[PDB]
Structures are given as C-alpha cells and as structure tokens.
Amino acid sequence: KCTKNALAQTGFNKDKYFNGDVWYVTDYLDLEPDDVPKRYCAALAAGTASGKLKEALYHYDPKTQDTFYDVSELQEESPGKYTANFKKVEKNGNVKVDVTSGNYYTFTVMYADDSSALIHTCLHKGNKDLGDLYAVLNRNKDTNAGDKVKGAVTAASLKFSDFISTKDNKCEYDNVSLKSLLTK
Ligand code: HEM
Ligand SMILES: [C-]#N
C-alpha cells in the first residue's frame, strides 16, 4: 500500500523543474524494501517535448552492472502531482515493454529549488501497489542535502537519518541518453 496524502509544493515552479535537465537521487527512503539487499543508483530528466511533459528514468546496479531506462508522458493531476504511464526502452528509445494500463507511477514534488528537490513516488506495476518511495534529488550528483531539503523532509514528518545515501554506491550515469530519451 502507498500514501496519497503527500503534499505538493505551494508555489511549485514547473518551468524550473521541467527544464530537460537531469536530477540525481542522492538519498532515498523505501517504506517497503525488498527482502534481497541491493545497491541503488537512479537519475531522471524531466522536461517537455512536442507539447507534453516527459520524464526519462534511469536505474543502475553498481554490483551487477545492470541498467534500465523508462520514458513516460506525464499528466498533471494538480501542480506538483503527476501520473506517469511508463514504457521500458533501450538507451536508444527501442521499446522493451510497451505502455500498459496497470503500469504507472505517481509522484509528488514536495519541495524544489534550482538545485534540489524532495519527491514522493508511488510505483504501481500491474494493479499492484509496489510501495512508498521518498527521494532527495540534486542537480549535482556530489552534493550533500542542504538545510532546505532537510527542513522539507522534517516538514513531511520523516527523519533524514532514516534516508540512505547513494553517494557511496560507486554509481555511473548516462545523462546523454537520459536527455535524448525525452523526445522518445
Ligand atoms: C527517482 C525516483 C524513482 C522513480 C520515479 C522510480 C520508478 C520506477 C519505475 C518506473 C520502475 C519500473 C521499471 C520498469 O520495469 O519498466 C522502477 C523499478 C525499480 N526501482 Fe525505481 N524509481 C525511482 C527510484 C528508485 C530508487 C532510488 C531505488 C532504490 C530503492 C529504486 C529501486 C527500484 C527497483 C529495485 C526496481 C525494479 C522493480 C521491478 O522491476 O518491479 N527506484 N522504478
Ligand atoms: C522504484 N521504485
């Protein structure tokens, strides 16, 4: 089960958020973690193209060297709250798993700067609610969360100390492909 009470930013600025640039996950909190331990890396690039909000996702496993991409067309529920119907693709846009009814995730932008953000995301993969996920994003992969995001984490009734840092997972990102999957 997920949470749908996550509160979107008051005066959230979408022209800055959706600029087609890359956001890196530097810290996160999984409320329903897998039974098998896993080092995780992820980044995304939210932007627009052809007239729609697009979001490109990236996951990497430094251990297995695994990598997978996704691209979705976003639909605005309210500013700050979005629903994404994703499709798994190769780094060049070739579709591995088409868009599907049961497949989608919804995220809420709880806080956002020109350099940082705090989001809540809920993944549904075929009618199954896959659980609550809170992520701390930064436009720079090597920066520690600032006082503003951390105040936002606290304002959400969470503890940052319960967050896990990806800073030490020997991550590797593909921003070139991330930015180009935006038009795919
Ligand atoms: C930046 C926010 C994130 C978003 C929007 C997001 C969204 C998703 C999406 C769309 C998928 C499905 C991929 C597919 O099969 O096509 C997925 C799978 C997965 N994500 Fe993320 N994710 C995020 C961050 C992370 C982080 C930080 C972790 C680490 C806890 C994580 C761990 C996983 C794992 C282990 C899977 C595979 C599960 C499966 O294939 O059913 N994700 N994620
Ligand atoms: C990914 N949850």
Side-chain angles (χ1 to χ4, degrees):
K1 264 176 224 113
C2 266
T3 295
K4 201 48 241 148
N5 275 156
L7 264 153
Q9 205 195 26
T10 14
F12 151 78
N13 184 30
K14 50 212 290 217
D15 299 72
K16 263 190 213 166
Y17 193 86
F18 291 92
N19 63 359
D21 247 22
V22 171
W23 284 111
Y24 298 100
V25 172
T26 64
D27 311 82
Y28 64 93
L29 176 79
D30 204 328
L31 288 317
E32 228 187 80
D34 227 270
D35 275 305
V36 191
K38 219 186 327 293
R39 241 145 85 229
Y40 241 99
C41 308
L44 59 99
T48 65
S50 292
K52 15 251 249 248
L53 295 156
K54 303 278 300 271
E55 175 142 283
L57 230 43
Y58 168 88
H59 286 75
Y60 174 72
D61 195 287
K63 218 209 129 50
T64 93
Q65 226 152 61
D66 236 91
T67 320
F68 64 97
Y69 306 74
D70 292 269
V71 157
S72 353
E73 260 183 34
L74 309 175
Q75 151 210 162
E76 193 163 290
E77 298 307 334
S78 137
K81 243 145 201 172
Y82 297 93
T83 289
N85 271 290
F86 64 86
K87 97 181 145 193
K88 188 134 116 100
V89 302
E90 298 281 3
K91 79 199 218 156
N92 62 0
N94 281 337
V95 199
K96 283 162 84 58
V97 186
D98 292 68
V99 174
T100 312
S101 277
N103 292 5
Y104 68 93
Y105 66 86
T106 66
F107 66 103
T108 293
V109 184
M110 287 162 88
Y111 171 85
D113 279 346
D114 278 84
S115 73
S116 72
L118 166 67
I119 78 175
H120 166 263
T121 188
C122 178
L123 177 48
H124 321 250
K125 226 223 203 120
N127 340 116
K128 217 244 136 340
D129 237 16
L130 271 50
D132 262 359
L133 198 135
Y134 292 100
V136 175
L137 323 176
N138 200 280
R139 290 277 195 200
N140 194 257
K141 65 192 217 129
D142 282 297
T143 80
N144 307 339
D147 289 358
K148 311 201 220 309
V149 185
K150 303 212 304 173
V153 165
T154 297
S157 287
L158 312 164
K159 326 226 67 261
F160 197 79
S161 49
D162 284 344
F163 270 69
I164 292 156
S165 185
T166 73
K167 167 98 108 122
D168 251 8
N169 300 167
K170 269 319 245 150
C171 298
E172 217 57 81
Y173 307 77
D174 194 20
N175 307 136
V176 39
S177 287
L178 250 197
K179 267 138 124 205
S180 23
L181 289 176
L182 242 16
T183 74
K184 307 298 198 167

